[PDB]
Amino acid sequence: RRALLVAGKTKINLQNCHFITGINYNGLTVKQLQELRGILRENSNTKLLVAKNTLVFKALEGTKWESLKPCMKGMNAWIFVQTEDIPAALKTFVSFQKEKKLFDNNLGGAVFEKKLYGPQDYKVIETMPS
Amino acid sequence: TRRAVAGTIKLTVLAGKASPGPPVSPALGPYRLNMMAFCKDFNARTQKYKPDTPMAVKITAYMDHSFEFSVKSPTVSWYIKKAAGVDKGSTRPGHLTVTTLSVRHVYEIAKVKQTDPFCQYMPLESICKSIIGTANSMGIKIVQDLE
Amino acid sequence: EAKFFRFLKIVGVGYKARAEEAGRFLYLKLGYSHEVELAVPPAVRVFCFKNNVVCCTGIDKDRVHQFAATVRSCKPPEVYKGKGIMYVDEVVKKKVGK
Amino acid sequence: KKGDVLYPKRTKYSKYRKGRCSRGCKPDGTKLGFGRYGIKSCKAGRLSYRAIEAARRAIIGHFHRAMSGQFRRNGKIWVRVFADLPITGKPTEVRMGRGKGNPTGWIARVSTGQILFEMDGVSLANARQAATLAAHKLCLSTKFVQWS
Amino acid sequence: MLKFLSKVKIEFNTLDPRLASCVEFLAQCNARKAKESNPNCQVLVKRRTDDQPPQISVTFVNGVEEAFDAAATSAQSIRKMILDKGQYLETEQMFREAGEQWPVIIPEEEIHQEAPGVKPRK
Amino acid sequence: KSTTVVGANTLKDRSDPKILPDSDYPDWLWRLLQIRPALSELRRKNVETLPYDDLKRFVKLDTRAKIKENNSIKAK
Amino acid sequence: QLEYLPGFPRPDAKHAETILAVPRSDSGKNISAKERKAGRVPSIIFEQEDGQHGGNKRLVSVQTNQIRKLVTHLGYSFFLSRLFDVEVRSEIGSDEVIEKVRALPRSIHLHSGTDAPLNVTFIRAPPGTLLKVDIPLVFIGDDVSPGLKKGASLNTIKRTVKFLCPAEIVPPYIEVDLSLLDVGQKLVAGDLKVHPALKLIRPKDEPIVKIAGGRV
Numbered sequence A: 001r002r003a004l005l006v007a008g009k010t011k012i013n014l015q016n017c018h019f020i021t022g023i024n025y026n027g028l029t030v031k032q033l034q035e036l037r038g039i040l041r042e043n044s045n046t047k048l049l050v051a052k053n054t055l056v057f058k059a060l061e062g063t064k065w066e067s068l069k070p071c072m073k074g075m076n077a078w079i080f081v082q083t084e085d086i087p088a089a090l091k092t093f094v095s096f097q098k099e100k101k102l103f104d105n106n107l108g109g110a111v112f113e114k115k116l117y118g119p120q121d122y123k124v125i126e127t128m129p130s
Numbered sequence B: 001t002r003r004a005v006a007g008t009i010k011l012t013v014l015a016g017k018a019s020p021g022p023p024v025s026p027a028l029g030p031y032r033l034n035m036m037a038f039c040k041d042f043n044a045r046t047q048k049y050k051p052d053t054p055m056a057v058k059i060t061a062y063m064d065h066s067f068e069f070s071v072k073s074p075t076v077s078w079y080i081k082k083a084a085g086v087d088k089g090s091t092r093p094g095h096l097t098v099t100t101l102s103v104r105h106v107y108e109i110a111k112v113k114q115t116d117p118f119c120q121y122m123p124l125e126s127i128c129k130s131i132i133g134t135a136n137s138m139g140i141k142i143v144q145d146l147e
Numbered sequence C: 001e002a003k004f005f006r007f008l009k010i011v012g013v014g015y016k017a018r019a020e021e022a023g024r025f026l027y028l029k030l031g032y033s034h035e036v037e038l039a040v041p042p043a044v045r046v047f048c049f050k051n052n053v054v055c056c057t058g059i060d061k062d063r064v065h066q067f068a069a070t071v072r073s074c075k076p077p078e079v080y081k082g083k084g085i086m087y088v089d090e091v092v093k094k095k096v097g098k
Numbered sequence D: 001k002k003g004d005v006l007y008p009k010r011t012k013y014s015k016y017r018k019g020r021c022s023r024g025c026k027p028d029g030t031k032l033g034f035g036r037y038g039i040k041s042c043k044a045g046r047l048s049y050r051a052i053e054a055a056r057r058a059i060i061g062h063f064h065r066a067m068s069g070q071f072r073r074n075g076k077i078w079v080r081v082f083a084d085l086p087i088t089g090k091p092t093e094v095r096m097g098r099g100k101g102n103p104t105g106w107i108a109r110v111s112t113g114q115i116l117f118e119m120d121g122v123s124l125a126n127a128r129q130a131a132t133l134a135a136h137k138l139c140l141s142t143k144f145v146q147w148s
Numbered sequence E: 001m002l003k004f005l006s007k008v009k010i011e012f013n014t015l016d017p018r019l020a021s022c023v024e025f026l027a028q029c030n031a032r033k034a035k036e037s038n039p040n041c042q043v044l045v046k047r048r049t050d051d052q053p054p055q056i057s058v059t060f061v062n063g064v065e066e067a068f069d070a071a072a073t074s075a076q077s078i079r080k081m082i083l084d085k086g087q088y089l090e091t092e093q094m095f096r097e098a099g100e101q102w103p104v105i106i107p108e109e110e111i112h113q114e115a116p117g118v119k120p121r122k
Numbered sequence F: 001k002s003t004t005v006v007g008a009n010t011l012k013d014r015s016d017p018k019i020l021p022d023s024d025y026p027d028w029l030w031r032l033l034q035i036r037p038a039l040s041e042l043r044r045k046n047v048e049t050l051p052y053d054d055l056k057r058f059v060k061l062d063t064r065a066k067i068k069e070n071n072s073i074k075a076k
Numbered sequence G: 001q002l003e004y005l006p007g008f009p010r011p012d013a014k015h016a017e018t019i020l021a022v023p024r025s026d027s028g029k030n031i032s033a034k035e036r037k038a039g040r041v042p043s044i045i046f047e048q049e050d051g052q053h054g055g056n057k058r059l060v061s062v063q064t065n066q067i068r069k070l071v072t073h074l075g076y077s078f079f080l081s082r083l084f085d086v087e088v089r090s091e092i093g094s095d096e097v098i099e100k101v102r103a104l105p106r107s108i109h110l111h112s113g114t115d116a117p118l119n120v121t122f123i124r125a126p127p128g129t130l131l132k133v134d135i136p137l138v139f140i141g142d143d144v145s146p147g148l149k150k151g152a153s154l155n156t157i158k159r160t161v162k163f164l165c166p167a168e169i170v171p172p173y174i175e176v177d178l179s180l181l182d183v184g185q186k187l188v189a190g191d192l193k194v195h196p197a198l199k200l201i202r203p204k205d206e207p208i209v210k211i212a213g214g215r216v
């Protein structure tokens, strides 16, 4: 039943998605998780979901997001973005990190156009606008 | 932060009357907390509000006597009883009825409750149905339109 | 060369321990008029430290644990103030005395 | 009925023969007649009216404490076994034959598969535990039966 | 769990699929119940794109360095073996502070010798 | 009385608000007391054809029911 | 028109097993005890057309584990208001199938003390045959009832209803809705929502369930 819950929760979120990331939520509380979800839900066009890694593993099979497979271990909060503006999508985490002083929770892994950029590699792509 | 959180204790104080003895006596003295600086910080912000209003203050006590508090709006029981009528709850709620409110008071109370410092992102349907659930819990009736 | 180790802590007003001969003889003072002498068996030696702590050190796990329980059984902890010999990691739960 | 302790108000004859009770079964199977749960017997024997009253009191007192308020009497009990055989008895320090003794009490003949109690209007767990409590007052071996 | 360590160095590759044990040890060592137990203890996270395998290299208070196979052993097995070495180090230090020689040597022939039961005596 | 709320707004410069007619208010206010269905109907239906809010209510009432049925049985 | 209408329950496909039997050569307590010791339940398959002269009967024996599993999983009354496939072969593991037929369990005998099955009865019900079937009731909507909300208690007068049913559309159970009953009222046997081709054997002015007021 929860398998169908998160299958629907990813089937709705993959309808307009163009890149996918996963954040290590070690040490984040419920209120700060809600604040991250709020910042990235009003100020952008993104959505946050914490899900079973094997269930996202099985629910992304047969899709162009099949390259992700190494980057699904440990504590994963999956962020699905239904929009295209990656500078405003990725600078919000910079503002969040520099404001609330959270170095223990970083961006590990992302998928854009059949490629897994390094966390160093999807740093310059937020500089280029549109 | 890095400090070992001891307790989180809440209280209700009327607006403007932060005299640290009738409600700020043993309630804050049970946890070794100070009574001067917290009252100064409390009276340094409720200058723009109507007095004799039961403002909700949650204070996170610490072992180094540091105050890190946020100010909450007055209680939804107060908001749903004072905007309705008599402040007396039923002997048997859900079956015995006191007052009646249709659709509008709960909706604007939800709009005011959205101003809670960690309710920036909860939807108005969520807040309205939460207040409906509170309204079920003291025995007041809700209808589509009182006439 | 020793491998198996066990530690004991003594709690009490005037309760004392002392090793006598090369770590082979153990002597104890538990509030009686006399003292308590125990002969540490082979494959085990005993040592005493400056926190009222007795160490049972040895090479045979059976003899080490049996002798540590033997030293403990001379005086178990009481439930009203915790006085006696106990294990270091052991928690003693007290109760109030009417 | 007679309130708690159940025996007939009057009978045709004062003294009855002893009879036999160690045999007898329900030759067609048994089903519940009024309730959803019930207690039936697995063996055949005798039960006294004091034991039946003690079992009924145990069930109603368990429902009394488990469920209160308006559901306190939502549990319904049917007692389907009735004690209508008087038993007699001679006192101490008496010889063998000068007639038949005075009656002392009443018993009920219970067969194999006879339903003693029936319960409705409660939870399944409350019914099972009330049957467990009631079977400790009866000398016979009982089973919990459920409607299906 | 964090009483006996001085510096920990975690190193791994982020796009290589064997990082589960090392990030689980990161979760074990960066808890709220951990860092309050040793405020002076240091953590060192390093990430690299190249193919150096994921390793946990720790040091203790008494200058002993230990490298562990973080690729094939789990974080909980690492947590058990660090304490297994740590309590031995503590026992060594506790013996050494009191004036006893370390390591203490017992003749390995008394295992064959018979021993009677220990009855306490006056 | 029935045309103004009392004691709602607490800003000293302003006043308590009024009761607007059904012209400024959006649609979802009058949907508040519809019969959101209970576990007697949602259990027997097909989960695969259920909409999002209904299946969310299904799993939430299922979790509440299993918590209550644990707490009522295991209690002594 | 011999099909279940929409809005009606249907027999489940989980409990749609086939019942396997082997022939039995005699009647009586001797061979009955021998079959029960060997681990089989005695049975007979018969038809309706000739009540005298037997009725084209065949004496068989079915498997105790299968029959006990069916009765435990379905319930006693639900097993008796549902059709089954019966396959009679000459031996267990043999392929010489003697008779495959669609039959109704007319009765099952359970021991009054141990509840082991002692006898199963099967009656041949091909399409076009009329039966007297006892259908169980299922009571729904007890959370919506205003009378039950007000603290009244439920008085279930009857649990099963006897009907005259053609074989094809025999209902497994009858759903009775209690959403709109307050304190004081009862439902009679004429309020049951059934197929129009089913005839009620009992008179329609027979109470089924009444909601009676609580002890104020």
Ligand SMILES: [Mg+2]
Residues within 6 Å of the ligand: G027, G028
């Ligand atoms: Mg015969």
